[PDB]
Structure 1
Amino acid sequence: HHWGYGKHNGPEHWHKDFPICKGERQSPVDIDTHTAKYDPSLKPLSVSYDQATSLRILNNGHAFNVEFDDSQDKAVLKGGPLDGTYRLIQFHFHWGSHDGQGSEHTVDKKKYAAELHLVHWNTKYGDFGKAVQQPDGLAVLGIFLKVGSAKPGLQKVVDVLDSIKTKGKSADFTNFDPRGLLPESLDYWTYPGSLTTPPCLESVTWIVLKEPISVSSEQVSKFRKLNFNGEGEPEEPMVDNWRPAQPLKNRQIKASFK
């Protein structure tokens, strides 16, 4: 292995192993609200997470992921810019070394303290491995975190982090309801983009919610107590695990709202 978020293996280095990290449809991007255009063709997002089945949470050395049972048409995303149905497979966050940075997307260059990614794959490709290779293979729902009042539905995630502090540690994480991580409004921006980590595959329809969720400083401070390293190795706090904005190139960001 090799890539990370360090000075010598970070975002500026990724293209050497993964040439598409310098591609035409890379994420994240800065969402320029001048540029972004209202598109009445877009429909309401449909987020159906009632039957979502979480399984476990894992520190993989880059972030922590909550994994779902994507076996049945349980938790699905559809509508908006999407054709057909996309199944929730995992979520994770990117966050900073302090509250003024951490998000991957930015809005008129404004950074948030963190960004949540709910990752879904297009059922027409049968499984995630096949889907990730296609231009319309994934849908990622991105949600900004700003520091304020606490988010009750995040508390179960924050409280489990102490038990998966180092790379490779996992914990059971059943009956977690990701609907508790959503803001009131589903107003969104959408554009075609990529995974924001290697292999940087250009397989993602990005749906970035205009409304952030508020989380408390205590909650986000718990993110920063995780470690990039494995147990018994020298301590490297897991912070600033975000990729900065990439060139928009020949893409238009559409808004679902006026």
Structure 2
Amino acid sequence: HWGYGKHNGPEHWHKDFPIAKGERQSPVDIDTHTAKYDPSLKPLSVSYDQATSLRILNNGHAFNVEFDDSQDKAVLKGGPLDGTYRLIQFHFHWGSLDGQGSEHTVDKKKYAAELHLVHWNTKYGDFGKAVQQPDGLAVLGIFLKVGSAKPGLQKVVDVLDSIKTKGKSADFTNFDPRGLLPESLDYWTYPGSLTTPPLLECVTWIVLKEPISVSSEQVLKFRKLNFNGEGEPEELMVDNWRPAQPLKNRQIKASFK
């Protein structure tokens, strides 16, 4: 029964999910002065040429664009990662206004939204096994600021009216997630967790330094989605972000000087 409200929001998650107070929780504030350049990191390899999107689903907390991950089509490799991570879905977190919405922050700055491209380590064979491992997932995080429209985001924006409420889905084939990437792949990386229950500590985070720009009209349409199911009292899907968590005994590394 968790969600984002007063009564069921991030401050309450620890009661059903005690790992909420664990040692490697996400998101975190990225203090740009404290993150150390690690000349040993690699260039990330984002290989999305063969990506096969299938469906888009309003799950009551966000919407997921789902991919065929039955074999190695769209994969993330390199950077801080060992081995091959298959793209399974992407989704966003966003705010009620442009001044909040991201989960990670940069020197305490909140972006209007944050995209997460979720990938799982194929050495564990399936996603449900991968989330039980400390190196099971790699989530590529991309900040959104409001300015010029992002042309590669418009197909997502235009299907949202058809999945307004929890449990609705729509066919969503042939979507190219390369159109959501910024120009630079410079990133910060640290070990963390899923940012929604069950909050599993299984994620290598890779957060791109360069935000993408989306238009105010684009993000306004995210904010017309609903957390509720069909016919239920309307609760706009906004502010579905978890705040920054304590860094504890972790190091955030930069891939760039």
Which category describes the TM-score, using the shorter chain as reference length? Answer: over 0.9
Hey, what does 1:93 align to over in structure 2?
A: 92
1:99-144 superposed Cα distances (whole Å, 9 cap, x missing partner): 0100000000000000000000000000100000100000000000
- Asked if residue 152 in structure 1 is aligned to residue 174 in structure 2, the reply is no
Provide the secondary structure at the position in 1 that maps to 2:11.
Answer: coil
Cα root mean square deviation, aligned: 0.3
User: In structure 1, what is the Cα distance between the partners aligned to 2:123 and 2:18?
Assistant: 27
Unaligned stretches of 5+ residues in structure 2: none
User: In structure 1, what is the Cα distance between the partners aligned to 2:197 and 2:101?
Assistant: 18
Task: Please list, as runs of the form range in 1=range in 2, the aligned pairs for 1:176-187 lying within 5 A after superposition.
Answer: 176-187=175-186
Offset of 1:204 from its aligned partner?
A: 0.2
User: In structure 2, what is the Cα distance between the partners aligned to 1:197 and 1:234?
Assistant: 23
Unaligned stretches of 5+ residues in structure 1: none
Provide the secondary structure at the position in 1 that maps to 2:86.
Answer: strand
User: In structure 2, what is the Cα distance between the partners aligned to 1:19 and 1:144?
Assistant: 28
Offset of 1:34 from its aligned partner?
A: 1.5
Offset of 1:180 from its aligned partner?
A: 0.2
Offset of 1:183 from its aligned partner?
A: 0.2
Provide the secondary structure at the position in 2 that maps to 1:56.
Answer: strand
Among all aligned residue pairs of Structure 1 and Structure 2, give the percentage whose two residues are the same amino acid: 98
User: In structure 2, what is the Cα distance between the partners aligned to 1:174 and 1:34?
Assistant: 42
Offset of 1:223 from its aligned partner?
A: 0.2
Provide the secondary structure at the position in 1 that maps to 2:96.
Answer: coil
Provide the secondary structure at the position in 1 that maps to 2:170.
Answer: strand
Provide the secondary structure at the position in 2 that maps to 1:180.
Answer: helix
Aligned residues: 257
User: In structure 2, what is the Cα distance between the partners aligned to 1:127 and 1:52?
Assistant: 18
User: In structure 1, what is the Cα distance between the partners aligned to 2:233 and 2:6?
Assistant: 17
User: In structure 1, what is the Cα distance between the partners aligned to 2:243 and 2:181?
Assistant: 23
User: In structure 2, what is the Cα distance between the partners aligned to 1:234 and 1:122?
Assistant: 40
Hey, what does 2:116 align to over in structure 1?
A: 117
Task: Please list, as runs of the form range in 1=range in 2, the aligned pairs for 1:224-235 lying within 5 A after superposition.
Answer: 224-235=223-234
User: In structure 2, what is the Cα distance between the partners aligned to 1:68 and 1:133?
Assistant: 21
User: In structure 2, what is the Cα distance between the partners aligned to 1:153 and 1:198?
Assistant: 30
Moved beyond 2 Å, runs of 4+: none
Offset of 1:163 from its aligned partner?
A: 0.4
User: In structure 1, what is the Cα distance between the partners aligned to 2:149 and 2:19?
Assistant: 38
Hey, what does 1:66 align to over in structure 2?
A: 65
1:170-226 superposed Cα distances (whole Å, 9 cap, x missing partner): 000000000000000000000000000000000000000000000000000000000
TM-score relative to the length of structure 1: 0.99
User: In structure 2, what is the Cα distance between the partners aligned to 1:33 and 1:120?
Assistant: 25
Offset of 1:81 from its aligned partner?
A: 0.1
1:20-64 superposed Cα distances (whole Å, 9 cap, x missing partner): 011000000000011100001100000000000000000000000
Hey, what does 2:81 align to over in structure 1?
A: 82
Provide the secondary structure at the position in 2 that maps to 1:141.
Answer: strand
Provide the secondary structure at the position in 1 that maps to 2:10.
Answer: coil
Offset of 1:72 from its aligned partner?
A: 1.3
